[PDB]
Symmetry: C2
Subunit: 99 residues, 2 copies
C-alpha cells in the first residue's frame, strides 16, 4: 500500500547530517521506526544523525555505561577471557574499560 513521491531536496547540513525533504509528505513520527532516522520540522526534512564511526573502544564504554545505569560497575580482571580480539585492540579496549 505504497505511494510514489518526488524528493524536493537533498542537503548536507553544517554538522554533516544528510536531509531528504519530501515532495509533500511529513513524517513527524518517523522516530517510531527505530531506524535512527529523525524528522526536523523547521525544514520539513527526514535526516540522519551526525556522521559517526564508532570504534570497539567506544562501544565497550557504551556497554559499560549501560550496565552502570542498571547498578553494576563492570571491571576487567586478570582472569577475564578475551576471545577473537586482536592484541592491538585488546590494549586499546583495556585502556577503554579503565578511562
Amino acid at each position: 500500500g505504497m505511494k510514489q513521491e518526488f524528493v524536493a531536496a537533498i542537503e548536507i547540513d553544517g554538522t554533516g547530517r544528510i536531509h531528504v525533504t519530501p515532495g509533500e509528505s511529513q513524517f513527524p513520527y518517523i522516530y517510531r521506526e527505530a531506524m535512527e532516522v529523525s524528522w526536523n520540522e523547521s525544514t520539513r526534512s527526514l535526516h540522519s544523525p551526525v556522521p559517526r564511526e564508532w570504534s570497539y573502544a567506544q562501544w565497550l564504554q557504551q556497554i559499560f555505561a549501560a550496565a552502570s545505569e542498571q547498578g553494576v560497575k563492570l571491571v576487567l580482571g586478570p582472569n577475564t577471557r578475551w576471545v577473537n580480539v586482536p592484541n592491538e585492540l585488546r590494549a586499546e579496549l583495556t585502556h577503554a574499560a579503565a578511562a
Copy 2:
C-alpha cells in the same frame, strides 16, 4: 550506593563483528530499556553492540528512504531535485544509491 562492582568474565567479538561483554554474575534483561543501543542476549548471557559499520551517505540515504517506505511512502529523485551543499561526486553516488 547500591552500585555493585563486578568482574567481566569475557570480552568477545563474534562472527558478525559485534562486541560482547559477559558479566560475571549479573543479568540485564531490560538493558534495551536504557535506550542506549545495548542489548542482552540471554542464550550467551552477554551485553552486546550492534553490527559495526562505517559511515556512508549512500547507505544513510537508503536508510532514510527505507524509513519513509515503512510509513507508506516510496521516495524518488527527480530532475527538479534540489541539492544543497552536496559536492559533485557525492551527488552522483547519492543518485545511484537512490536508484539501486
